[PDB]
Paper text:
X-family DNA repair polymerase (pol) λ performs gap-filling DNA synthesis during base-excision repair (BER) and DSB repair. Erroneous X-family polymerase (pol) λ nucleotide insertion leads to genomic instability in double strand break and base-excision repair. Here, time-lapse crystallography with right (matched) and wrong (mismatched) natural nucleotides captures snapshots of pol λ undergoing DNA synthesis. The intermediate catalytic states uncovered reveal hidden fidelity checkpoints that enable DNA polymerase discrimination between right and wrong nucleotides.
A 2 min soak in a Mg2+-containing cryo-solution generated the Mg2+-reaction state (RSMg) ternary complex that displayed ~50% incorporation of TTP. Cleavage of the Pα–Pβ bond, inversion about Pα, and Pα–O3´ bond formation were evident. Apart from bond formation and cleavage, the RSMg structure was similar to the Ca2+-GS structure. Octahedral coordination geometry and coordination distances (2.2–2.6 Å) indicated the catalytic site was occupied by a mixture of Mgc and Nac. Binding of Mgc resulted in a change in the primer terminal deoxyribose sugar from C1´-exo to C4´-exo, repositioning O3´ into a catalytically compatible position. The broad omit density surrounding Pγ in the GS was not observed in RSMg. The altered primer sugar pucker and stabilization of Pγ upon metal exchange in the catalytic and nucleotide metal sites allowed Pα to shift closer to O3´. Asp427 could be modeled in the GS conformation and in a rotated (~90°) product conformation. This rotation was observed concurrently with loss of catalytic metal coordination upon bond formation.
Residue numbers in the entry: 251 to 464, 470 to 575
The structure:
DNA sequence: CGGCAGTACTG
DNA sequence: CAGTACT
DNA sequence: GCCG
């Protein structure tokens, strides 16, 4: 990154807007920051600033203040609440609205939350694992977790296919969590497996707590056996084989990659989700779907790219 | 002016 | 529903 | 915040 001296300070403002609930402005900042992180050359002129897609006048104005002054004055006026709101919204299950409410109620520390806050079931689990859930794990450990799930799944039905997606499949050296996709080529045998699979994973103590237990998605907490192990977040999704490619594409991400691909699909009169790529999507002036299109056949990830007019990108080059 | 991705889950 | 979360 |  040729512009750390710029993006480092912009990340601070971005985070501030984010934890305070100003999501669209934070989005703008996030996008400008990626753009600036990707520019070969350091940004040396306002005129060059506006050159970058994702940098407007307001953003160029700021980047010149830093290159001239070495600082950004707006940093000095960020509300004193922001570190506390960040502290609180790093509890899994608590977002900006809950953090703001706890702040308004006078809470300032996790000890305050522990002793005085009303916590949802999910938030109590998040609090219990506060430090662990902020740690990334070695990808070698994500491998062990994926293998644990696969062996438990295969025990019931040999034919079940299990794949660790997310940052793991994008090849990263560390992973925030483990994202396992499960399906079955027969197109039928995936149904109703969660009961048995999850019960199997609790049997000898691997699954330690459940956060979400839906018909298609599980989000929870696991810990491998032995000493020196931390609790890790584990997501599992079970999908029909006909949706495998789009589920794989969604679950591999990155998030910003997914949002860019879906935005592209919308421009082309199409819609892309975890379930399918659809064409002839009828929308309103609000950008929202009011009429459903036709599902297009997408046997492989490459097919999704092709139908969108894009060259195929391996998971490693989706790390946006 | 107004979208900024599209979806699942919780209570 | 609003909130939070997933990529 | 940015952009069509
Ligand atoms: Mg992940
Ligand atoms: Na620009
Ligand atoms: Na949170
Ligand atoms: Na009190
Ligand atoms: Na995940």
């Amino acid at each position: 990154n040729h512009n750390l001296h710029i993006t480092e300070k912009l990340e601070v403002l971005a985070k501030a807007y984010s934890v305070q609930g100003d999501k669209w402005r934070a989005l703008g900042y996030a996008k400008a920051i990626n753009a600036l992180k990707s520019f070969h050359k350091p940004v040396t002129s306002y005129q060059e600033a506006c050159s970058i897609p994702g940098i407007g006048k307001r953003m160029a104005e700021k980047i010149i203040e830093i290159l001239e002054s070495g600082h950004l004055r707006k940093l000095d006026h960020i509300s004193e609440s922001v570190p506390v709101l960040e502290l609180f919204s790093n509890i899994w299950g608590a977002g900006t609205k809950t953090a703001q409410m706890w702040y308004q109620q006078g809470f300032r520390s996790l000890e305050d939350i522990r002793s005085q806050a009303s916590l949802t079931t999910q938030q109590a689990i998040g609090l219990k694992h506060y430090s662990d859930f902020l740690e990334r794990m070695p990808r070698e450990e994500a491998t062990e977790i994926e293998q644990t799930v696969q062996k438990a799944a295969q025990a019931f039905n040999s034919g079940l296919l299990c794949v660790a997606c997310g940052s793991y499949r994008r090849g990263k050296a560390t992973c925030g969590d483990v994202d396992v996709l499960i399906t079955h080529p027969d197109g039928r045998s995936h149904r109703g497996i969660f009961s048995r699979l999850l019960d199997s994973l609790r049997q000898e103590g691997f699954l330690t707590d459940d956060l979400v237990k839906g018909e298609t998605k599980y989000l929870g907490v696991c810990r491998l056996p032995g000493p020196g192990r931390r609790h890790r977040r584990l997501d599992i999704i079970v999908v029909p084989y006909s949706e495998f490619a789009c589920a794989l594409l969604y679950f591999t991400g990155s998030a910003h990659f997914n949002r860019s691909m879906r935005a592209l699909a919308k421009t082309k009169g199409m819609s892309l989700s975890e379930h399918a790529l659809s064409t002839a999507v009828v929308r309103n002036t609000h950008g929202a779907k009011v009429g459903p299109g036709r599902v297009l056949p997408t046997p492989t990830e490459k097919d999704v790219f092709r139908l969108l007019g894009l060259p195929y990108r391996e998971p490693a080059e989706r790390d946006w």
